[PDB]
Ligand binder design. Structure first.
Ligand SMILES: Nc1nc2c(ncn2[C@@H]2O[C@H](COP(=O)(O)OP(=O)(O)OP(=O)(O)O)[C@@H](O)[C@H]2O)c(=O)[nH]1
Ligand SMILES: Nc1nc2c(ncn2[C@@H]2O[C@H](COP(=O)(O)OP(=O)(O)OP(=O)(O)O)[C@@H](O)[C@H]2O)c(=O)[nH]1
Ligand SMILES: Nc1nc2c(ncn2[C@@H]2O[C@H](COP(=O)(O)OP(=O)(O)O)[C@@H](O)[C@H]2O)c(=O)[nH]1
Ligand SMILES: [Mg+2]
Ligand SMILES: [Mg+2]
Lengths: 426, 68, 23, 427, 48, 436
């Protein structure tokens, strides 16, 4: 009944979404060929949120891959679970933006975006009751930033009352992959602030710190990062699918978190995370879940919450629990850390429970906090963007493609008068 | 003769080739202004839905007042 | 303008239903 | 996804001679063009089971191309892509550019056109020449203008064998190089310089070669080009293309001159013993002793660098090594580049080329940087050009060919303006 | 160079019609709020 | 649906000697009038109907009339490698030479041999069941080809009339030339050819030399090299009747869709791909680039730039396995191509014939075995320049009455000289009035 279409923008977004689908397929019990091979019927009770039925029981995903080079499409197809995807929606160009916000917002999206809107319209009126949209992308690149933000603008202009969830890999300059990450990131946040409705901030620095400390991994690949991100990606939308003693719809979360219209960037976390050599030596109780969940070195962002204040927090538990215990733990936390939580919002934490855990774990939990620390994360990018902008470096590659300097100055002004409200409410 | 031809060519190709840059700047800035036009249209849409909601609420309020 | 008419038509419908009930 | 290779002059033709014999064995294609889709960027399938390279070899003197026609790859190339003039340019820029160039450059263009027509998804061009001589300088400065005015929007990666200060075979290089670098400044887009003396020193130190001929050098540059194009030929966890590279690096329109480096440039006897990993291969690439142009990276601040990792490299040790190199104070980045690295990775190990001393290694780094250190290069070559031009020496050949005395002055002022630009952006 | 100026003139005309749209939107919104507040005040007053 | 062939003059009979070899190779007929005993047949028992006829026991004989006056090449054929193939009577050799003289070719010696060749033509036609048309092969620059050829053309028009005629005639080049008195013969034969031959196809010695120099990579070509690709062109033209064509064009499509006015029938010819073994397997032969090379001006058998004129109409015969989508896209690309321009009164002007037979290969030849080939016959308006240049050559000779006594010593007067002149002038005027 409730519905979420999925869109995968760019190389990083495509990879994250591919792992996310290989995770959700397991959580719902299907083989990579597409059929159903599971144990319970509560798996398929409510798979209409992400799946579509074909003639023969071949379930396909309500997903739209998108990029500008065929290489990522070929890699996704080559990887396992690349068959379930509907071949129709693999929209792609040929030139590639080449980390050029101009070539992702003004040149290649000039033509490919009519086709991608046609596909998303097909998918949207294929279902009956849309609840929201989902996008996976990275603001530090060039074909996931301009292309993703223009897609968000198109969908916002088209469907006004169907909100979007965007999972944005914000470029933290402790991981360096390209030079123009702060040209792309600020210019994408310029529109993400006003158009989208929720943005989960993720980052490779914190993901690497997690895989180093908590997972006790020696050599983790991008697969482990994507498998970790899939945890929150498939935990935010578990109240939609499985029954709960206290449901939490996506708009439930939106209302309970977002205090003011301009503040919809959230920091996420997943619990329990454990190494193969300590899983045997630890137990699993709700207090343990809470203390591992709130630990600042577990958040998947470059923003230590002790530097900031939790405006509104949210917890999503999965598995058989005790609601009195859950509420007692949350009020214990809000009474102990009585300085971080804002004073004019009593009981800043909203909890919710669901009756089905992730496959394998007896209990689990996901954390979503609207902390005001992220003003540091955004100033850390704004000052770098200004650092290059002062001496006019790498700018003609945008100016010669129609984009004036007014756009850059306005983007900087909006990035400034976002952290303005963060500080004002801190 | 060949020297005169070369002089003619270099002059005519030096004159062959920036105000169009500023004019196209004006064009793109006005394209931004018409994105603002679309913004005005969506503001009109918002006012329209607000008018609908206000009429519904006031009609139900009048029904309630008649009920009381 | 025509967009105002769509709101005016809904108002007309609600008033017509009210009047029919009163009849 | 395509780039077409044009070789001009003896240096470029021989560099391509090594480069193509590298590619053929890296893809598995026999000399006479048959397997026993990654080749699509370079080789095009023609007929059945036959592959032809997307290249044209061009020179005025015929014997250098006759070497290719009579070698072991005689079946490989299209029998017409091996162009030949009739009389050598005689290391005279004016003679190569004006007098002889007209009859053959139109043929070159009319062949490039049909190569591009055979191609569909072209990225662009890669050209090979040396700015020291006359052929590869005049013909280069004419052909590049022709392509920049015909195709215009394409990217022309120019790998130029720039002449070294001390070691120098020719004698009119101070003239030929400035006459070439007038055009090369404003007609190509990325100009990767290479210096014979620097690569000689690299061969002497790393490979303990005390008689380094041109063959080993040519194999080395071939490996560099293969590492550059591997991201397009194959797949990797973190890739890079022509637009990627060329809009990430070039800060301003008139600052594009790469410094190239490679690692591990190690023979078999040391490669079997000494261990290899990313966190020390990256520093090894940055060391001045292993940079391919006779320049001093210490004097000039770095502006933007690009790294490419062939072989099994996970994307975390590259991050760690970038951290552990940016933490060293000896190398200074430019003030306005808070992040100055673009990293790319692959899944294929470098292929050992039989007939050489290069090792068969698990992983390798190719580094292409853009830094203000190259100002002294232009300054010193212009100084020796001034030395030669003070007494109007050697000007009579060019004057008789047709070039006046004032274009030398305009080109010299162009080089001076280039040096001023580098100083201003260093400030 | 002059065809781009012709496009500029077309955009001049579109700016003028945008101004007329601004005027129409302002009139509609102002009349909306005035009538709505008076009507709501009337129906909060009469039934008391 | 048989087609008969007439070869007149030394050039015509040499082209026939180098072309009937191609036919007998295409239909697998041994070079002595028989098929091999073993089944080595491409397919069908009537692909050879148009050129041969079984007689009791596998003894095929070509439908050819090799008519020539001076018997040095006719008997060269008679003693060549084709003796048990040709019909002993078809090979008509006269008594003496024509000697570049239209007079001796058309009045003195011609009159006593036309009525001897005509009876053989009549016997061949009566034997034929579904006769399609005539294919004439001749040289206007000589005596027998021009004189005897024109006489035979006139005396076949007077008799059969309705049947179509395709005249492959060679002209002198603008600069390269062998005969001295060739302009006179050229204009005299052109007057006769104008209103009798239904469709005139043009060839030029230098225009084939330069193609064999730039494409086949031969710096010393010869007649035995030109005639092979002339045979290739005529085979590409005639393959539609022979082999099963998905979109095939019989002989009357040329006249139906490529002769908008009866006066206007003069056509450039092109043939792609002209490639040898060395570069054949290195290049890729595709319907885009073969067609583009067909429509480039550097691959025409008539030395004339099509730029100076406007392509009135065109026909493209495709051999080999070609899918019609690519040829449709290719003609679309041509219509979008800038350099070549059409008269605006013809919106559709591309006939696209296609067959299912790949081009053949002759042992010891130059061209290699290829997938597909294309023959482009274009009714353009650049040929008026050819006629005008030939006329300007003729004027200087005629002004001084040079060589005229040799002509007028026979039945030829000066009235027909003048009338041929004014006929060429009228052709010039017609072509120019077509204009824009
Ligand atoms: N790497 C490399 N460089 C070469 C080779 N041969 C010549 N060079 C360089 O080319 C520079 C001068 O160019 P030339 O030797 O004149 O070659 P060219 O420019 O093609 O001149 P031409 O003889 O007219 O063809 C010299 O300073 C050499 O450093 C070679 O085989 N390999
Ligand atoms: N392409 C080509 N042209 C030929 C060949 N043989 C003769 N010609 C042409 O024929 C022209 C002259 O005509 P002739 O060859 O003498 O033919 P003809 O009409 O029989 O003249 P006579 O032999 O004197 O009766 C020359 O200009 C040649 O161009 C040939 O084998 N190939
Ligand atoms: N989770 C994940 N992140 C990736 C992967 N590949 C690249 N990234 C991240 O994506 C960021 C850059 O995005 P990029 O691919 O350049 O964007 P694009 O060029 O527009 O497609 C880098 O900081 C990488 O850390 C992947 O496979 N998984
Ligand atoms: Mg040389
Ligand atoms: Mg004769």
């Amino acid at each position: 009944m409730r519905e979420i279409v999925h869109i995968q923008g760019g190389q990083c977004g495509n990879q994250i979404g591919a792992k996310f689908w290989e995770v959700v397929s397991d959580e719902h019990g299907i083989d990579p060929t597409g059929t159903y091979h599971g144990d319970s019927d509560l798996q398929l009770e409510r798979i209409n949120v992400y799946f579509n039925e074909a003639t023969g029981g071949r379930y396909v995903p309500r997903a739209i891959l998108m990029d500008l080079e065929p290489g990522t499409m070929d890699s996704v197809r080559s990887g396992p679970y690349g068959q379930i995807f509907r071949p129709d929606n693999f929209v792609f160009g040929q030139t590639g933006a080449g980390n050029n916000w101009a070539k992702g917002h003004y040149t290649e999206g000039a033509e490919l975006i009519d086709s991608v809107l046609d596909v998303v319209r097909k998918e949207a009126e294929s279902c009956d009751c849309l609840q929201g949209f989902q996008v996976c992308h990275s603001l530090g690149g060039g074909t996931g930033s301009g292309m993703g933000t223009l897609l968000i603008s198109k969908i916002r202009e088209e469907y006004p009352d169907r909100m979007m969830l965007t999972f944005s890999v914000v470029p933290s300059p402790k991981v360096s992959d390209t030079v123009v990450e702060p040209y792309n990131a600020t210019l994408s946040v310029h529109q993400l602030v006003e158009n989208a409705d929720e943005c989960m901030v993720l980052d490779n620095e914190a993901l690497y710190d997690i895989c180093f400390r908590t997972l006790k991994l020696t050599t983790p690949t991008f697969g482990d990062l994507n498998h970790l991100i899939s945890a929150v990606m498939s935990g935010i939308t578990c109240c939609l699918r499985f029954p709960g003693q206290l449901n939490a719809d996506l708009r439930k979360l939106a209302v309970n978190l977002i205090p003011f219209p301009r503040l919809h960037f959230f920091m996420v976390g997943f619990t329990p995370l454990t190494s193969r050599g300590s899983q045997q030596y630890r137990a699993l109780t709700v207090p343990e879940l809470t203390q591992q969940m709130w630990d600042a070195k577990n958040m998947m962002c470059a923003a230590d919450p002790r530097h900031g204040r939790y405006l509104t927090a949210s917890a999503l538990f999965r598995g058989r629990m005790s609601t009195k215990e859950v509420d007692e733990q949350m009020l214990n936390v809000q009474n102990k850390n009585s300085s971080y939580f804002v004073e004019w919002i009593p009981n800043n934490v909203k909890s919710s429970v669901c009756d089905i855990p992730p496959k394998g774990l007896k209990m689990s939990a996901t954390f979503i906090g609207n902390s005001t620390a992220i003003q540091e994360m955004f100033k850390r990018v704004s000052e770098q963007f200004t650092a290059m902008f002062r001496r006019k470096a790498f700018l003609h590659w945008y100016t010669g493609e129609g984009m004036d300097e007014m756009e850059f100055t306005e983007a900087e002004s909006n990035m400034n008068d976002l952290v303005s409200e963060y500080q004002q409410y801190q | 003769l060949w020297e005169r031809k070369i002089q003619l060519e270099k002059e005519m190709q030096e004159v062959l080739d920036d105000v169009v840059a500023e004019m196209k700047k004006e064009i793109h800035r006005m394209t931004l202004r018409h994105t603002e036009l679309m913004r005005l249209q969506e503001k009109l849409v918002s006012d329209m839905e607000k008018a609908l909601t206000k009429r519904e609420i006031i009609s139900v309020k009048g029904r309630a007042t008649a009920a009381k | 303008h025509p967009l105002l008419r769509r709101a005016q038509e809904a108002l007309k419908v609600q008033f017509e239903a009210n009047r029919t009930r009163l009849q | 996804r395509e780039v077409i290779s044009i070789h001009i002059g003896q240096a470029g033709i021989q560099v391509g001679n090594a480069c193509w014999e590298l590619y053929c064995l890296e893809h598995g294609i026999q000399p006479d063009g048959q397997m026993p889709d990654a080749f699509n960027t370079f080789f095009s399938e023609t007929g059945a089971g036959k592959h032809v390279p997307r290249c044209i070899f061009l020179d005025l003197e015929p014997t250098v191309v006759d070497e290719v026609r009579t070698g072991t790859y005689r079946q490989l190339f299209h029998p017409e892509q091996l162009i030949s003039g009739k009389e050598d340019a005689a290391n005279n820029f004016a003679r190569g550019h004006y007098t002889i160039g007209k009859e053959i450059v139109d043929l070159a263009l009319d062949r490039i056109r049909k190569l591009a027509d055979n191609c569909t998804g072209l990225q662009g061009f890669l050209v090979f020449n040396a700015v020291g001589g006359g052929t590869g300088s005049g013909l280069g400065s004419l052909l590049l203008e022709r392509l920049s005015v015909d195709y215009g929007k394409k990217s022309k990666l120019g790998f130029t064998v720039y002449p070294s200060p001390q070691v120098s075979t020719a004698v009119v290089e101070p003239y030929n190089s400035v006459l070439s670098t007038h055009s090369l400044l404003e007609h190509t887009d990325v100009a990767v310089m290479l210096d014979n003396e620097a690569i000689y020193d690299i061969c002497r130190r790393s490979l303990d070669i005390e008689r380094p001929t041109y063959t080993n050098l040519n194999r080395l540059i071939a490996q560099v080009i293969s590492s550059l194009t591997a991201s397009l030929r194959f797949d990797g966890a973190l890739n890079v293309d022509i637009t990627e590279f060329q809009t990430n690096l070039v800060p301003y329109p008139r600052i594009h001159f790469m410094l190239s480096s490679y690692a591990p440039i190690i023979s078999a006897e040391k490669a079997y013993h000494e261990q290899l990993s990313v966190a020390e291969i990256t520093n090894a690439a940055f060391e001045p002793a292993s940079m391919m142009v006779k320049c001093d990276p210490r004097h000039g601040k770095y502006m933007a660098c690009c790294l490419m990792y062939r072989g099994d490299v996970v994307p975390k040790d590259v991050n760690a090594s970038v951290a552990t190199i940016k933490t060293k104070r000896t190398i200074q980045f430019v003030d306005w580049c808070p992040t100055g690295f673009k990293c790319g990775i692959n899944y294929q190990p470098p292929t050992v080329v039989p007939g050489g001393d290069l090792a068969k290694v698990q992983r390798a780094v190719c580094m292409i940087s853009n830094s203000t250190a190259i100002g002294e290069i232009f300054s010193r070559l212009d100084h020796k050009f001034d030395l030669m031009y003070a007494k109007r020496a050697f000007v009579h050949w060019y004057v008789g060919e047709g070039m006046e005395e004032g274009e030398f002055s305009e080109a010299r002022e162009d080089l001076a303006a280039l040096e001023k630009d580098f100083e201003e952006v260093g400030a | 160079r002059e065809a781009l100026q012709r496009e500029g003139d077309d955009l001049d005309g579109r700016i003028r019609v945008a101004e007329k749209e601004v005027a129409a939107l302002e009139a509609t919104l102002a009349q909306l709020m005035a009538v709505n507040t008076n009507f709501a005040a009337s129906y909060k007053k009469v039934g008391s």
